């Protein structure tokens, strides 16, 4: 766990081995400072429709989402999925964050 030592490798692959397929992705991200480290009450403006009124909070926190099928399937891997299978479902996932560089 050092400065000049990699903490993970690029895994971006898909393996079909029977009744299972494992889809692995890897992406590069960038996380800025959100709200200048503040929590802020957000709401709708006072001049707005009643359907569009909201109340909530924004955080300094970012979030990772991979809730799209193209995040894990290529179009060729999606074509293998849909012309050969009557059904599919997820079983387990594995998540990693690595090679983190904080730039000032």
């Amino acid at each position: 766990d050092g400065v000049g030592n990699s903490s993970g490798n690029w895994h971006c692959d898909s393996t079909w081995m029977g009744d299972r397929v494992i889809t692995t992705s890897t992406r590069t991200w960038a996380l800025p400072t959100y709200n200048n480290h503040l929590y802020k009450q957000i709401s709708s403006q006072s001049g707005a429709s009643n359907d569009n009124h909201y109340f909530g909070y924004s955080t300094p926190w970012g979030y990772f989402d991979f809730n799209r099928f193209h995040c894990h399937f290529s179009p060729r891997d999606w074509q293998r999925l849909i012309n050969n299978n009557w059904g599919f479902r997820p079983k387990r996932l594995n998540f990693k964050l690595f090679n983190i560089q904080v730039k000032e």
Partner: protein, 103 residues
Amino acid sequence: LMGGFGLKHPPPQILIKNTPVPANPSTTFSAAKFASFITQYSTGQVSVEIEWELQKENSKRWNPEIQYTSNYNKSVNVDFTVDTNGVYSEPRPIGTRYLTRNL
């Protein structure tokens, strides 16, 4: 050259023949061969069971490939299907070269 598998020892010829059943011979001896036979034919069932070895594909191709498909557009007759008279027909020749491979 017509396509296929060249075999030094191919699947052998399977030859079949009705045994000649003669009609009634003359009650005196005749050294001539029989030209009169009982007219008969045979029927039955035939089964061939071939095992084929497959070669799966390992392409790292991104975009989708050309494949043999049926068209969804409606028609009076479904392809590779009997018609209203019970006549089976094959509409087109289907080759086997649809996936791709790099040289």
